[PDB]
Amino acid sequence: KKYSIGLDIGTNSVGWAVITDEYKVPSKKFKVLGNTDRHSIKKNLIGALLFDSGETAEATRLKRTARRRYTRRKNRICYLQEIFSNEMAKVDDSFFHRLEESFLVEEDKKHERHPIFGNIVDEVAYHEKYPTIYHLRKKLVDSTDKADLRLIYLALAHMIKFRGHFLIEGDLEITKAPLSASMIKRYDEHHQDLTLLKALVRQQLPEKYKEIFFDQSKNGYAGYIDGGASQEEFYKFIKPILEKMDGTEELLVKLNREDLLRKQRTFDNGSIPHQIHLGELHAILRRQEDFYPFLKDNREKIEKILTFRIPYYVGPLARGNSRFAWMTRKSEETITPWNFEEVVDKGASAQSFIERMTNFDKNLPNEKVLPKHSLLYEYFTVYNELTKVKYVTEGMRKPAFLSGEQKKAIVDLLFKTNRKVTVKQLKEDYFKKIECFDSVEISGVEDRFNASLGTYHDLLKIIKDKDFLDNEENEDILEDIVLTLTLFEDREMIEERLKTYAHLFDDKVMKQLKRRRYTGWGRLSRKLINGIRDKQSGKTILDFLKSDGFANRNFMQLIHDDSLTFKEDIQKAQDSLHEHIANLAGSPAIKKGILQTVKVVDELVKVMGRHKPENIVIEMARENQTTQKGQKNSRERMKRIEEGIKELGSQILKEHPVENTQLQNEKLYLYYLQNGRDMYVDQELDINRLSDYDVDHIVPQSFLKDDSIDNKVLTRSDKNRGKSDNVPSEEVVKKMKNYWRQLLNAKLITQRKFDNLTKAERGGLSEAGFIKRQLVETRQITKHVAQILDSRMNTKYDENDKLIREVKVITLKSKLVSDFRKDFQFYKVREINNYHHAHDAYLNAVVGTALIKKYKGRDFATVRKVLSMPQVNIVKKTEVQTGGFSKESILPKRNSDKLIARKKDWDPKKYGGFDSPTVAYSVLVVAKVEKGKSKKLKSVKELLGITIMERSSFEKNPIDFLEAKGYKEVKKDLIIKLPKYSLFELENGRKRMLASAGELQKGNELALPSKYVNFLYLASHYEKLKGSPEDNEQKQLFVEQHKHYLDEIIEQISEFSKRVILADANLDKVLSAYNKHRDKPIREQAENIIHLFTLTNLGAPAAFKYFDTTIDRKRYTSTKEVLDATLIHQSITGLYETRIDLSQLG
RNA sequence: GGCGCAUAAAGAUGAGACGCGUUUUAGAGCUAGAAAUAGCAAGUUAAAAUAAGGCUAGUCCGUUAUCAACUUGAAAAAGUGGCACCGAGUCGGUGCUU
DNA sequence: CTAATCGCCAGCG
DNA sequence: TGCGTCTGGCGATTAG
DNA sequence: TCTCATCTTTATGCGCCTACGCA
């Protein structure tokens, strides 16, 4: 009794099948536990397993970073108040208390309602004086009177709370405050344009006044200020309205300059650097320092509060209780911004910032890896390249390798004098000094060398000496200096780390040395290449690479030679399952899929009677391309850039050159791919800044999940942040269409990028689906499952060998199984049911077993029979929902009872709050409740929804929690928890999956016979054949003679919808729509039948479109029947069941 | 199947920062009216919060991953279900033998 | 009169 | 003995 | 949206190792 297992791995499914030698699938009677009458189920050992897609940890990281900046901002304002507190309480000792409780309603305050001055007349006079805050900042900068302390605090707090960016470094008329003057100018232009437009629309269009200046739901002015209208929607609304009137020339000029009715705080203010606010702050401090003494006492503290920023290599200032921290302290105290550099050790933390990320040597797992631009690494690579070259000459019968003196003189002569060398320069420049040069034929290499001592060239250029770099006694010192130039990339600590070596070099070369910068880490450690030795040689690895007798062994032949003592040192140098899976590296989605398929194959081993299988057949997703297209997809970027530059008009490369290694940043590759212009406005682009402009995806990240070069476009700052969540509008198309079509001719961009560029010529969304992230995940997951199944299954070590092959792991390609499917007409359609996962897993097993055994033409009847079985165990994995508490938006107040509060003492009837929480799992309770006016105990049995916010408070103590919810006399033994996708069997074989708390989902499958899916696959793809046509007219007339089949297919849906669907309105509507289309060609009828099949899929209900009639979705919104149905508890494969009957509870 | 070098594409993990947006309050609305209301004036800013919160009280942590039931175990983790044969509308029946 | 049913809506550069 | 790898929540509305 | 750093996988070109069943 020997069997084999076929798997099929995807990103949302795992298909498993168990075959015998004759390609059968056995059936077995399994015992079912519980409290029902039936005690045995016959089931077939074939199935699939479906689950929700595992997601990445990016959004959690973004919200985790966003959580810290709010606490740091509150701490900044707390530091400012702690400075001001004493002199603030000297004059008005309720001011910060009034500022802290301004959010509360008029009766929840404990003080006067006006926050600044308390009384009414002072607040009214203050707001009549300064209409904004920028008037106050300009007045405090310019004037020289002793201002009130509260206005000074308000100006300083507004400067500190919003402070600007930090991209530039160092430092950077009638007034000294240009920003406040610019905002005051914008405010005055707004006022003048408003009164002019008001008078003009009063004159020329008296009927359209209320729609503009009074409606709050439209996109007029009253919708621009109070409603939810942006600037672009308001401009697009108002532009034809004043284009139709007369006397609006300057307003159209301003609207074409985007300076009409503008606000102060808007979206494109992000370009303001913090030096402007710093100048305004220093100005008002130097102005008012004479009156108040304590402003002059600690001006530098207040200026330090604004400019302080935690460096990116230090990290979160923890105290040994975080999970992401690496900071180390020199003391134990509180880290204010004033004593930062007197507490935290910057050097050790900056070293641990880098060292915690890098790899280990994969051959010596305790040593750290060498830098990439190190000297020993470059020597190793260039000798490993040189010690396998072969030359043939005039007196050469059999070819030979080089000599140790020859390889010494070669690296002494031409490698140490050129950046990159060629094969022609090696044949000419060296062999001109050699007599034996006549018929040189050099094999094993290509036209140029792919290894270079470029760090040696930069060091001889800097230090201007060869005697220091030629010696060996300096050697380790050189290693150390490269380490410093890889670790600390901030030129304040490099001087402290490098002061020990300036006693050997000059001062000018020391000043020119610290501007050097390297990056990248290698793949091997220095204890592998110079630490270990051989037994009796006295030679290291690199000593063998300098000279190796006659063999000229390379690195792999060195560390795999059994005649030496390297393999034994590697072998003498070289836990839980879920811990090892957590110890893997990669995306968590393939971690989920790997864990599921390992649990499935382990459980299948456990089912079959503890016997290990013979073969395990998996299908991978790697290919074997051709050399032409493979090298065309491997050609560099300086090919394509120079080709397009040669094709079109070009003057940018006259004074701005570009090599093939300097072009790797995405803010320069797009600058040269777009010929030095902004792609949303015809204007000249700069390279002197090259960072202040922004890269933007054409289709936004909200709708799609791609960030490739076919979607990224480098634009200006205001153009990217002008649009938010849409393809750019038809004005951008009508302006830049000719320029984009000119750039399309040079083949800089593709047709898909230009298709995404003008999606607005069709709509904001035409349709999604096929994304190459799944193509990454499938390849990763099949490589991992092959490695871990070979590691886990075969355990017994052989004595003189590695192990004993008790079970083989075979890996196949999809081309072979698709060829087998296309040969013998075993077709498949993805849009009928979910049986195709189990079916192609079975096909993988059959093809792999037959290809190993035989090389088959007699027995196809058993394959055609098992490809039409009605019973396939489909299991949807029950999960417990975790994530956000509710929707993120904040709804305004209403008198409803489904508004979750935002804080503890903020009642939602007067403050508003969140809404629609996410239900983690449900429970089945039974108790007695007071029935309102009767108020006596009446028996109930219903479903509760435990949200994510209340999960801990439920699991702490359930009885008092749901007692305070409004229940009494409950049975704690009779509480059943129910996660998502819990399975209920109702009457007549109708299955339902519990969606959240009052919603269900369709559970049954559709078993369609093989003749119908064969005729339906041939009915589609009619005009195509994917090749040359022969013997397909018989297939065409076979489709033509079987139209009646299609009518039967409608019957095959209809009675099924009478059994488990119960959605009769959509059913007879769509059969009427089918009866109104009994005359079309067969191709369109099949193309719409495959759209009709989404009525009876598994899972959530959906909406679709038959011909032009759109059928909307019938949702299931009642859970008062699954209280009296059979609850199923399924295993990981669905072979082990536990059936609870809920009708006998009570 | 697995390494080392060069080129290119697709991504992943972590740290530091900006700019908005949303919600309540504050910015005394005037006139004619019993009024349901109508005419008129006005609008650009600020405070606070930005997952409820938690204890380990940090300028820290709180949306990723693990998760069927049953019997043990504090958890970690372990254990729990007979075989052939004829057939097939979501699995049925037959004989062995427990 | 309370439970189906329709239609809208969902933090971002 | 050699050789290839999108779906639930919610208000407004209707039907019973 | 900006700045910084480190990793994986895939395909070509060059050199090289081995497991193991297949011709």
Side-chain angles (χ1 to χ4, degrees), chain A residues 14 89 109 132 212 239 540 564 757 891 970 972:
Chain A
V14 169
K109 299 182 178 53
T132 44
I212 302 178
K239 171 200 176 67
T540 69
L564 298 175
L757 266 160
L891 280 78
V970 319
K972 204 181 174 170

Short mmCIF file of all heavy atoms in Angstrom, two decimals, chain A residues 14 89 109 132 212 239 540 564 726 757 891 897 970 972, unseen atoms left out:
data_model
loop_
_atom_site.label_atom_id
_atom_site.label_comp_id
_atom_site.label_asym_id
_atom_site.label_seq_id
_atom_site.Cartn_x
_atom_site.Cartn_y
_atom_site.Cartn_z
N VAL A 14 -4.71 26.17 -1.33
CA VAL A 14 -3.78 25.04 -1.31
C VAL A 14 -4.57 23.82 -1.73
O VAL A 14 -5.53 23.44 -1.05
CB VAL A 14 -3.16 24.83 0.08
CG1 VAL A 14 -2.43 23.51 0.12
CG2 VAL A 14 -2.22 25.96 0.42
N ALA A 89 1.23 82.64 35.34
CA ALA A 89 0.42 82.67 36.55
C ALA A 89 0.57 83.97 37.32
O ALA A 89 -0.26 84.26 38.19
CB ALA A 89 0.78 81.50 37.46
N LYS A 109 -17.53 73.20 30.67
CA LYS A 109 -16.38 73.98 31.09
C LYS A 109 -16.51 74.33 32.57
O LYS A 109 -17.60 74.33 33.15
CB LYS A 109 -16.27 75.27 30.28
CG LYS A 109 -16.08 75.07 28.79
CD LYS A 109 -15.94 76.40 28.09
CE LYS A 109 -15.71 76.22 26.61
NZ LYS A 109 -16.76 75.35 26.03
N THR A 132 -6.41 87.31 11.62
CA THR A 132 -5.78 86.00 11.54
C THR A 132 -4.69 85.94 12.59
O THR A 132 -4.61 86.80 13.47
CB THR A 132 -5.21 85.74 10.14
OG1 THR A 132 -4.52 86.91 9.68
CG2 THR A 132 -6.31 85.39 9.16
N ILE A 212 -24.66 79.85 -5.41
CA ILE A 212 -23.24 80.07 -5.20
C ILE A 212 -22.97 80.44 -3.75
O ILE A 212 -22.22 79.75 -3.06
CB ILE A 212 -22.70 81.17 -6.14
CG1 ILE A 212 -22.95 80.80 -7.59
CG2 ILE A 212 -21.22 81.36 -5.91
CD1 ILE A 212 -22.48 81.86 -8.56
N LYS A 239 -15.59 78.23 -13.10
CA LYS A 239 -14.94 78.76 -14.30
C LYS A 239 -15.89 79.02 -15.47
O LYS A 239 -15.83 80.13 -16.04
CB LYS A 239 -13.76 77.86 -14.69
CG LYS A 239 -13.13 78.18 -16.02
CD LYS A 239 -12.34 76.99 -16.54
CE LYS A 239 -11.77 77.25 -17.92
NZ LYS A 239 -10.74 78.33 -17.88
N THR A 540 46.87 30.66 3.38
CA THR A 540 45.48 31.01 3.60
C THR A 540 44.68 30.74 2.32
O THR A 540 45.15 30.09 1.39
CB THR A 540 45.35 32.46 4.03
OG1 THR A 540 45.71 33.31 2.93
CG2 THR A 540 46.29 32.75 5.18
N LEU A 564 41.95 18.59 1.32
CA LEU A 564 42.36 19.66 2.20
C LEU A 564 41.50 19.63 3.46
O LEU A 564 40.68 18.73 3.66
CB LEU A 564 42.28 21.00 1.48
CG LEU A 564 43.21 21.11 0.27
CD1 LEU A 564 42.98 22.41 -0.47
CD2 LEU A 564 44.65 21.00 0.73
N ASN A 726 -6.93 60.42 -8.04
CA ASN A 726 -7.46 60.20 -9.37
C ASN A 726 -6.36 60.37 -10.40
O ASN A 726 -5.34 61.02 -10.16
CB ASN A 726 -8.63 61.14 -9.67
N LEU A 757 -1.57 57.08 -18.51
CA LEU A 757 -1.43 58.54 -18.50
C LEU A 757 -2.74 59.22 -18.89
O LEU A 757 -3.06 60.30 -18.38
CB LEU A 757 -0.31 58.95 -19.45
CG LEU A 757 1.06 59.15 -18.83
CD1 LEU A 757 2.13 59.08 -19.90
CD2 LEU A 757 1.12 60.48 -18.10
N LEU A 891 -17.69 61.37 12.37
CA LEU A 891 -19.00 61.83 11.95
C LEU A 891 -19.53 62.89 12.91
O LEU A 891 -19.27 62.81 14.11
CB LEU A 891 -19.98 60.67 11.88
CG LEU A 891 -19.95 59.75 10.67
CD1 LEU A 891 -18.82 58.74 10.72
CD2 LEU A 891 -21.28 59.05 10.52
N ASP A 897 -27.89 55.87 18.51
CA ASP A 897 -27.30 55.07 19.57
C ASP A 897 -26.17 54.18 19.07
O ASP A 897 -25.77 53.26 19.79
CB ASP A 897 -28.38 54.22 20.24
N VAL A 970 -27.62 33.58 32.97
CA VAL A 970 -27.00 32.98 31.81
C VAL A 970 -26.37 31.66 32.23
O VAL A 970 -26.21 31.36 33.41
CB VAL A 970 -25.95 33.93 31.17
CG1 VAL A 970 -26.48 35.34 31.17
CG2 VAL A 970 -24.63 33.86 31.91
N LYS A 972 -22.96 29.65 31.82
CA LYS A 972 -21.57 29.82 31.41
C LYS A 972 -21.02 28.59 30.71
O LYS A 972 -20.09 28.72 29.90
CB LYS A 972 -20.69 30.16 32.61
CG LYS A 972 -19.41 30.89 32.25
CD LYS A 972 -18.56 31.19 33.46
CE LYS A 972 -17.22 31.79 33.05
NZ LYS A 972 -16.45 32.32 34.21
#
